[PDB]
Write a protein that binds this ligand. Structure first.
Ligand SMILES: */C(=C/C(=O)N(C)C)CNCCOc1ccc(/C(=C(/CC(F)(F)F)c2ccccc2)c2ccc3n[nH]c(F)c3c2)cn1
Ligand SMILES: */C(=C\C(=O)N(C)C)CNCCOc1ccc(/C(=C(/CC(F)(F)F)c2ccccc2)c2ccc3n[nH]c(F)c3c2)cn1
Lengths: 242, 232
């Protein structure tokens, strides 16, 4: 199906890992004043500000993910529109691994469960994120594995379409699936290099990709809450630079 | 411990043996929004009874705590209905085989509230399974994975659940190796299938939002039915 000659598809596993590690966005500081007690609007202010800012840098990151700028502009936009909260979340749970009971939103913004209660609904999402981070800590998730998963989330985010598909959209989806197969290869390689048996490799690949269902769930629940606070892309198009 | 000893071939055998009966709708051969929702609700409610009986036969599930058995089914039931739907629908491009006498096209999908958006997503997933030539043996592995995964993070009890999930991954790989796939092709197909499950979860979440909205005729809430059938 795909007609595109994409550099990503002929990268070796090591080269894919290197490119992903190089793409990582900068580490950002919240505008959080620790002498200021939290209220609902103040916490939602802090988080929203952090999310808006992370989104700018996420655009720059996505441009450096091999295979991503080979998609049509419309398809790049769609992936980012679908995936942004999942991508924030996986970042959060990775950073929070060595902080049992707490979510490291930023270096200066470390929140425990109880501080989630200052916003209606949000402690439910907090618990799920905490559980996810503990899961990654127990599995001893490696940085190289993390960046593979975050790229998988981006590429897998798009809405499934049958009646709503065009011949062109279908070529684009085929290109996505090839990029995804390269990332799977890269994950397996990393595992094989770390000394896992073949059985252990296939088991861990499954365990990590099953956690992505949980990330999707958390994002969906997040989105429901944001939509019900009346939140409501010309950036995206123009930053993605076409 | 019997469950944890199963070979790949034995796992397949047990899961195939656990499969529920295929149900018929009460459909009488015109569809309103109200009669369609009525038909779908009555079907879902009858499927649920058989889903509970099925889950009791998935290796390892009756080793779990009552809480875990109830919680896994409460979180997963719509995903489980949906995977079964898209599987049954693979030989019916553009349609959804809710039951043998209830085969619906997207036109009929517009009958009911926020089914229309979900409908195309289900058709696409069916189409993806068809294109991948998903086999029945792979389908029952994936459906048991949904059960054991959908509530597992939402400590030694979580370990048992994880060990059984690993066994099913081993079973999938075995099936693929037996079908002639290379090791590379095995790991790629595994990943492709598990990423589809993210999308099934998303479809279920979207469906749940409409069920909460709408809402119901909730005489026997699912949590009560689960407790009755599993406390027992
Ligand atoms: C009462 C409210 C609650 O459910 N609640 C949690 C407060 C209604 N309870 C009975 C369950 O009702 C029910 C379940 C499933 C479906 C259903 C569909 C069809 C589709 F969208 F998934 F395609 C549905 C329609 C509209 C909104 C949500 C879901 C359905 C029914 C039967 C199925 N068999 N295989 C499947 F995949 C099915 C899906 C409707 N109502
Ligand atoms: C909507 C307008 C509005 O609030 N009103 C009142 C009109 C704002 N729309 C922009 C997006 O805002 C966001 C995005 C993300 C979040 C994050 C959270 C935290 C958690 F729940 F995910 F934990 C959130 C809170 C409440 C509901 C949904 C999400 C968030 C922020 C920063 C992050 N960095 N890494 C992450 F994982 C997150 C998550 C808040 N507001």
């Amino acid at each position: 199906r795909s007609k595109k000659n994409s550099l990503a598809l002929s990268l070796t596993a090591d080269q894919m890992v290197s490119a992903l590690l190089d793409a990582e966005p900068p580490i950002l500081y919240s505008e959080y004043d620790p002498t200021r007690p939290f209220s609902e609007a103040s916490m939602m202010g802090l988080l929203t500000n952090l999310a808006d800012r992370e989104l700018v840098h996420m655009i720059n990151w996505a441009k450096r993910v091999p295979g991503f700028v080979d998609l049509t502009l419309h398809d790049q936009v769609h992936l980012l529109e679908c995936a942004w909260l999942e991508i924030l979340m996986i970042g959060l749970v990775w950073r929070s691994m060595e902080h049992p009971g707490k979510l490291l939103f930023a270096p200066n913004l470390l929140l425990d469960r109880n501080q989630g209660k200052s916003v209606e609904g949000m402690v439910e999402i907090f618990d799920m994120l905490l559980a996810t981070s503990s899961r990654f800590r127990m599995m001893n998730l490696q940085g190289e594995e993390f960046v593979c998963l975050k790229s998988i989330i981006l590429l897998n985010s798009g809405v499934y379409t049958f009646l709503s598909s065009t011949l062109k959209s279908l070529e684009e989806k085929d290109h996505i699936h090839r990029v995804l197969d390269k990332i799977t290869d890269t994950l397996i390689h990393l595992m094989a290099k770390a000394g896992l048996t073949l059985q252990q490799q296939h088991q861990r690949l499954a365990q990590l990709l099953l956690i992505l269902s949980h990330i999707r769930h958390m994002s969906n629940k997040g989105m429901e809450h944001l939509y019900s606070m009346k939140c409501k892309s010309d950036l995206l198009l123009e930053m993605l630079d076409a």
